[PDB]
Symmetry: C2
Subunit: 580 residues, 2 copies
């Protein structure tokens, strides 16, 4: 059956990104004798350069690693709230929600240290060799996707009149980025060059990376980041606000390692980031399922997954965060889920219905009843980044880097990129698992995956898309497990090509945090009689464009044979797999 690309098959290496330049750059590292981790670092810094409307160096990343021999391990590069970032203080500024923009929304930048840790512990190449790709595209340029310039044009007024440091970089002479022309960021290029220059004498390979961690943390980069954070900056409130971020917030924070959250289902184990991410909501969706699923791709199959997703999202909202303990074991226990799956009815729920793990009463944010109505604001994703790598030794990696995008903070002038906005996902209200809390991660949408089959790592995957990330991935992963193999291998690309969907019947992670009761969005190429079945069952169905749902990436290994594979999303003509 026709797929938009092949599910690539090979024996040397495989890469799948949300951007071809990053895929091929990561692959170049494999060709040069590097490993999956070297590769992913290189690709990640290329992604800063080629998707700056969707990520940047002062953003975040969860990384799932599965080294050939050993344990599936999480590397947390999601930063924390600053020491002065209290609910009280934000409330004191007459705010009910954390703003979508500006330095009040910035968490401590976590991505950089995370990639440095990865390189130091699991890589083999020096910083210089792995980050030369991004430097080259930064200083000498690349032909951007139309969404870069279209994004800049959305915040033209804001840039010209207010965030003038961003105008300097993205509107040189008032000229927005155009496709077919070389887009440059010479400042960002200068920033990595300086970084490299002043760590070159630091010693051996590992010492150079460690010295670079300190340059980000206490050096010229940190100085500039703090300096920018403390400058009054216009945001979504309509006032110029200042950030509580300080030199010591940066100096104290490092990326850390963790065990993954895991769940065994039907011969597979899925690995995710802990409940400080939304990661576990995929696992909760799997735990909800009965043993005997309806026909793959049928109306009953979709309906079942939508209602199950609603119930898992409710639990996400009620229970997930980093300001409290999360009762994850109980949320994935058979006992709990046996109760919960009965709540799947013939009709579509328009209600947010969190459960009671261990008898605990669910406490929700005051904003959790609020209804988003209108059309959604500009989507820079419309038709976060992602990359996966598997190498010749069988090491795998799956990372979902995001934040520090161009349209939500002014550029830090001496660096070339802005601060992030992830604190927007917390609540300005005390006593909750996701209450804005000093030294704590916001509840982050970034959620890569690694799948085991019989306890062996076989698939590394992910996608951007905010609150759709672990909906789209759930649909994908089930398709992979339920679809007939193609060329004696997992039908990765057929699963990606497959019509995908999402719901919005829960409070969104992004400012202004509305929900759309009973709202579900299918691609136009889903069977129209399925769409008709759902409306009949009380769904409020929006029929989106044919090639609009999911920016999936996947790499895989067959353990029996050693053969590496890869697929990538065709929607938005940007995502791309490479290997051999």
């Amino acid at each position: 059956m026709f797929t938009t690309r092949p599910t690539l098959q090979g024996t040397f290496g495989m890469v799948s990104s949300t951007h071809w330049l990053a895929s091929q750059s990561a692959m170049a590292v494999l060709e040069d004798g590097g490993n999956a981790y070297d590769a992913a670092v290189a690709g990640a810094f290329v992604l800063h350069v080629v998707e700056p409307h969707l990520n940047g160096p002062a953003g975040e990343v969860p990384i799932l690693l599965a080294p050939a021999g050993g344990e599936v391990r999480v590397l947390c590069g999601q930063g924390v709230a600053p020491a002065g970032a209290t609910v009280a203080h934000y409330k004191g500024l007459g705010l009910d929600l954390v703003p979508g923009t500006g330095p009040l929304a910035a968490a401590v930048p976590g991505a950089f240290d995370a990639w440095m840790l990865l390189l130091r512990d699991h890589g083999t190449k020096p910083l210089a060799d792995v980050l030369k790709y991004a430097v080259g595209y930064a200083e000498h340029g690349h032909a951007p996707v139309e969404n870069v310039g279209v994004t800049v044009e959305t915040v033209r007024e804001l840039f010209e009149t207010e965030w003038t440091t961003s105008a300097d970089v993205y509107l040189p002479g008032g000229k927005a980025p155009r496709p077919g022309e070389l887009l440059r960021n010479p400042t960002l290029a200068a920033t990595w060059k300086r970084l490299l220059a002043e760590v070159a004498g630091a010693g051996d390979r590992e010492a150079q990376i460690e010295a670079a961690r300190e340059v980000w943390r206490t050096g010229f980069i940190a100085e500039a980041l703090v300096r920018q954070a403390r400058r009054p900056t216009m945001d979504t409130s309509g006032e110029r606000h200042t950030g509580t971020l300080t030199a010591a917030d940066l100096a104290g924070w490092s990326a850390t390692y963790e065990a993954p959250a895991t769940y065994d289902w039907n011969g597979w184990t899925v690995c995710k980031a802990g409940p400080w991410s939304q990661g576990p909501v995929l696992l909760q969706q799997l735990a909800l399922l009965p043993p005997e699923l309806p026909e793959y791709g049928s109306a009953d199959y979709v309906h079942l997954l939508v209602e199950g997703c609603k119930l898992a999202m409710a639990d996400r909202e009620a229970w997930y965060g980093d300001a409290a303990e999360v009762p994850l074991d109980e949320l994935l226990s058979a006992e709990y889920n046996a109760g919960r799956r009965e709540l799947v009815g013939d009709k579509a729920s328009h209600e947010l219905r969190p459960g009671s793990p261990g008898g605990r009463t669910a406490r929700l944010s005051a904003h959790a009843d609020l209804v988003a109505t209108g059309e959604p604001g500009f989507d820079p994703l419309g038709a976060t980044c992602h990359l996966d790598v598997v190498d010749r030794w069988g090491n795998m990696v799956a990372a979902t880097p995001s934040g520090g995008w161009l349209q939500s903070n002014p550029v830090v002038p001496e660096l070339g990129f802005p601060l992030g906005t992830r604190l927007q996902m917390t609540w300005l209200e005390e006593g909750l698992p996701n209450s804005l809390t000093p030294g704590r991660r916001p509840r982050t949408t970034l959620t890569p995956s690694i799948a085991l089959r019989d306890g062996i790592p076989v698939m590394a995957f992910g996608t951007p898309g905010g609150d759709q990330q672990d909906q789209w991935q759930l649909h994908f992963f089930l398709a992979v497990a339920l679809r007939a193999r193609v060329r004696g291998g997992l039908d990765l690309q057929g699963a990606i090509d497959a019509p995908n969907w999402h719901n919005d019947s829960f409070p969104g992670s992004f400012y202004p945090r509305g929900m759309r009761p009973g709202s579900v969005t299918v691609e136009a190429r889903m069977d129209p009689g399925i769409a008709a079945e759902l409306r009949r069952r009380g769904h409020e169905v929006t029929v989106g464009p044919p090639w609009s749902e999911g920016r999936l990436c996947a790499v895989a290994r067959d353990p029996r044979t050693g053969i590496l594979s890869a697929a990538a999303n065709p929607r938005g003509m940007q995502g791309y797999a490479v290997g051999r």
Copy 2:
């Protein structure tokens, strides 16, 4: 508008080929500092390993090269008929046509020497580094596309019963190649290793290549080839025949350079191989077109092109070959074509109507009227090879290697691959341009393209598909020129994606050489109203599957901006572009 892949855009390298493993192997040569020519060579030898149902080392290749500074140039690796290969001799075996299989159909193997010349004149890498990719996939293996094993299965009786040296390689223990399992050819692997071992002490970089040319020509390779050729071998006639191919034929033959056939149209120049190929039929079709074309993609646009193609093909049957001078200037002159386009009527032609260039009367083969009936032979292309490269210096190649496929000659047992079958395209009748003639090349279907804009090299492209090659390529090139730019660049992939078509209203190049009067084949995704228009206009319309016409590859450069691009065909999930 949605396309199955992006039109990749970048500044370091682009590769497009009919198999992803070849593309990435050629790309790996670029990543290691090689040029477009180094890369093409590597890709080509990988192609032997990964598409042995569609090419091999003892086949042939035309190579169009466009080095950055200088002249577009042809490198001819189409071999000639052997010294003893006369119409009389073959007529003495009671043959009316040259067989589709067996040693009688083998031209002198041309491809190897052609790659060696390219390597030595225009490359920068040693032979060892350029073909280590092929060696690895040969000895350690690769996961084949289903068409490999399906092709083998079609020819099982013949292998087991008759061509037992092929059974040894392709049916070890009776087991055909399976997708998802590692297919190997340890003998082919052993062959290149030996080649490299005895050439390594030869001296400087080019002396090794030169010594390698002689190993092929007069060494252990040539000995085996001749030995195999002189073994009584069952062919399509039902009789075991022997080849006239001798040691001396191999010792005397070299690949040679030539000027391309060229034609200026609408600001472009299309470059092709000389009329010993079908290359000039693309050119003839261009010259046939009026200045004022109909609406792109409309019924009138298709009809015009179909009837124009019939006319141009009639001229290749009548005039094209290597056994006589070809009146090319006259066939491409405006006076001639002005008269010919009047032959395009409202109704569809079911006749073969060659013209009279310079008043010369057309002489046709006695077989030119014979009709193909019933359904076709197994199509190994069904859902030759091709690869294009452009490098960071702006050098370009386009090559369509072919021949030496597994289905049509027994494996040379000490080498791992069989001889070719390109003499099947000649006629066993004297006095014709394409009369089977000693020391002449058969008129060959292999036809790469390079396109100029304002006399500057802009696009390198090609496709396999025998008598469809320069039909599909014509529809593609026109679409490139007529479709609106995407991302400020040529719409390469939209042009590839576009519904494509072909006619069979001329005598085919392949044994048994039928023709299907008035017959045309459109993809199912072409507007059904267009099909209905053609039947109304007297076409025999076959509606083929949606994703079935064309295996296009393309790379391109933008001369103003220096940006490289690529696209590849999605049909058969095999063709793939890579670059950055």
